[PDB]
Design an enzyme around this catalytic site. Structure first.
Site, PDB file in Angstrom:
ATOM      1  N   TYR A  27      -5.139 -32.600 -13.531  1.00 10.49           N
ATOM      2  CA  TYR A  27      -6.156 -32.382 -12.449  1.00 10.49           C
ATOM      3  C   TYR A  27      -7.140 -31.247 -12.595  1.00 10.49           C
ATOM      4  O   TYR A  27      -8.162 -31.289 -11.936  1.00 10.49           O
ATOM      5  CB  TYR A  27      -5.484 -32.291 -11.038  1.00 10.49           C
ATOM      6  CG  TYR A  27      -5.001 -33.624 -10.660  1.00 10.49           C
ATOM      7  CD1 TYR A  27      -3.708 -34.037 -10.977  1.00 10.49           C
ATOM      8  CD2 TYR A  27      -5.856 -34.515 -10.056  1.00 10.49           C
ATOM      9  CE1 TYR A  27      -3.277 -35.325 -10.659  1.00 10.49           C
ATOM     10  CE2 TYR A  27      -5.442 -35.758  -9.743  1.00 10.49           C
ATOM     11  CZ  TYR A  27      -4.161 -36.171 -10.068  1.00 10.49           C
ATOM     12  OH  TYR A  27      -3.794 -37.451  -9.726  1.00 10.49           O
ATOM     13  N   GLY A  29     -10.197 -29.484 -13.786  1.00 14.77           N
ATOM     14  CA  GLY A  29     -11.396 -29.898 -14.509  1.00 14.77           C
ATOM     15  C   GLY A  29     -11.723 -31.357 -14.290  1.00 14.77           C
ATOM     16  O   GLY A  29     -11.450 -31.905 -13.223  1.00 14.77           O
ATOM     17  N   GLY A  31     -12.119 -35.069 -13.618  1.00 11.34           N
ATOM     18  CA  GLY A  31     -11.331 -36.150 -13.018  1.00 11.34           C
ATOM     19  C   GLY A  31      -9.881 -35.864 -12.614  1.00 11.34           C
ATOM     20  O   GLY A  31      -9.389 -34.728 -12.590  1.00 11.34           O
ATOM     21  N   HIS A  47      -6.953 -28.922  -4.544  1.00 15.42           N
ATOM     22  CA  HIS A  47      -8.387 -28.572  -4.601  1.00 15.42           C
ATOM     23  C   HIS A  47      -9.306 -29.814  -4.688  1.00 15.42           C
ATOM     24  O   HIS A  47     -10.275 -29.870  -3.945  1.00 15.42           O
ATOM     25  CB  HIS A  47      -8.637 -27.601  -5.788  1.00 15.42           C
ATOM     26  CG  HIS A  47     -10.025 -27.030  -5.807  1.00 15.42           C
ATOM     27  ND1 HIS A  47     -10.959 -27.385  -6.749  1.00 15.42           N
ATOM     28  CD2 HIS A  47     -10.659 -26.199  -4.946  1.00 15.42           C
ATOM     29  CE1 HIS A  47     -12.083 -26.717  -6.529  1.00 15.42           C
ATOM     30  NE2 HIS A  47     -11.922 -25.978  -5.451  1.00 15.42           N
ATOM     31  N   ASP A  48      -9.012 -30.780  -5.594  1.00 17.28           N
ATOM     32  CA  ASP A  48      -9.708 -32.046  -5.624  1.00 17.28           C
ATOM     33  C   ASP A  48      -9.650 -32.784  -4.261  1.00 17.28           C
ATOM     34  O   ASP A  48     -10.658 -33.302  -3.783  1.00 17.28           O
ATOM     35  CB  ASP A  48      -9.104 -32.961  -6.697  1.00 17.28           C
ATOM     36  CG  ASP A  48      -9.528 -32.579  -8.137  1.00 17.28           C
ATOM     37  OD1 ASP A  48     -10.162 -31.505  -8.339  1.00 17.28           O
ATOM     38  OD2 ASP A  48      -9.172 -33.337  -9.084  1.00 17.28           O
ATOM     39  N   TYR A  51     -12.027 -31.035  -1.664  1.00 17.74           N
ATOM     40  CA  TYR A  51     -13.394 -31.460  -1.895  1.00 17.74           C
ATOM     41  C   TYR A  51     -13.608 -32.901  -1.406  1.00 17.74           C
ATOM     42  O   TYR A  51     -14.679 -33.228  -0.894  1.00 17.74           O
ATOM     43  CB  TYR A  51     -13.662 -31.409  -3.414  1.00 17.74           C
ATOM     44  CG  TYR A  51     -14.078 -30.065  -3.975  1.00 17.74           C
ATOM     45  CD1 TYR A  51     -14.094 -28.916  -3.172  1.00 17.74           C
ATOM     46  CD2 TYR A  51     -14.480 -29.959  -5.321  1.00 17.74           C
ATOM     47  CE1 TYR A  51     -14.503 -27.674  -3.680  1.00 17.74           C
ATOM     48  CE2 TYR A  51     -14.879 -28.730  -5.849  1.00 17.74           C
ATOM     49  CZ  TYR A  51     -14.876 -27.591  -5.018  1.00 17.74           C
ATOM     50  OH  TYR A  51     -15.270 -26.360  -5.552  1.00 17.74           O
ATOM     51  N   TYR A  64     -22.202 -20.591  -1.948  1.00 20.07           N
ATOM     52  CA  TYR A  64     -21.863 -19.861  -0.708  1.00 20.07           C
ATOM     53  C   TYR A  64     -21.669 -18.375  -1.056  1.00 20.07           C
ATOM     54  O   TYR A  64     -21.670 -17.990  -2.214  1.00 20.07           O
ATOM     55  CB  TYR A  64     -20.607 -20.452  -0.100  1.00 20.07           C
ATOM     56  CG  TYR A  64     -19.447 -20.458  -1.107  1.00 20.07           C
ATOM     57  CD1 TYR A  64     -18.704 -19.275  -1.397  1.00 20.07           C
ATOM     58  CD2 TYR A  64     -19.134 -21.603  -1.807  1.00 20.07           C
ATOM     59  CE1 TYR A  64     -17.634 -19.279  -2.309  1.00 20.07           C
ATOM     60  CE2 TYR A  64     -18.086 -21.615  -2.723  1.00 20.07           C
ATOM     61  CZ  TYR A  64     -17.335 -20.458  -2.957  1.00 20.07           C
ATOM     62  OH  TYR A  64     -16.336 -20.528  -3.871  1.00 20.07           O
ATOM     63  N   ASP A  89     -12.130 -23.461  -2.187  1.00 18.09           N
ATOM     64  CA  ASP A  89     -12.117 -22.696  -3.441  1.00 18.09           C
ATOM     65  C   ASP A  89     -11.183 -21.483  -3.293  1.00 18.09           C
ATOM     66  O   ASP A  89     -10.393 -21.191  -4.192  1.00 18.09           O
ATOM     67  CB  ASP A  89     -13.513 -22.199  -3.746  1.00 18.09           C
ATOM     68  CG  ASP A  89     -14.403 -23.238  -4.336  1.00 18.09           C
ATOM     69  OD1 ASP A  89     -13.986 -24.396  -4.573  1.00 18.09           O
ATOM     70  OD2 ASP A  89     -15.568 -22.874  -4.542  1.00 18.09           O
TER      71      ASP A  89
END
Length: 121
Positions: A27, A29, A31, A47-48, A51, A64, A89
């Site tokens: 996971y 990076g 895809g 994290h994926d 998002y 941000y 993040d």
């Protein structure tokens, strides 16, 4: 954006996002498929997912602002997208910091065909 995210990671962990975290496991990076390999990989998975909750934000390119209040990452007030990207993040950076002890070079550049399984967000 990746600028802010990369910086957060380095401050938090002492490691450079590229290449410690840009091709780790299933996971981190490019895809995501399969079952995360370890705690660090689970951080990238979550994290994926994070998002994935913001279908109309642009987390790679939207910048941000954040600051450190003593040690702590604090996301500054921007648009609604910026705020939510920042919270995604920030959580990943901390997750990385929390699992630095089990970080494994064995998982750097991990081959795609070994990423097997289903995992829903």
């Amino acid at each position: 954006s990746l600028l802010e995210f990369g910086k957060m990671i380095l401050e938090e962990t002492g490691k450079l996002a590229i290449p410690s975290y840009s091709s780790y496991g299933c996971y981190c990076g490019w895809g995501g498929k399969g079952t995360p390999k370890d705690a660090t990989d689970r951080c990238c998975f979550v994290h994926d997912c994070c998002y994935g909750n913001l279908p109309d934000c642009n987390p790679k390119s939207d910048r941000y602002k954040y600051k450190r209040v003593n040690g702590a990452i604090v996301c500054e007030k921007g648009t609604s997208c910026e705020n939510r990207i920042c919270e995604c993040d920030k959580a990943a950076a901390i997750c990385f910091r929390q699992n630095l002890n089990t970080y494994s070079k064995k998982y750097m550049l991990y081959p795609d065909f070994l990423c097997k399984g289903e995992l829903k967000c």
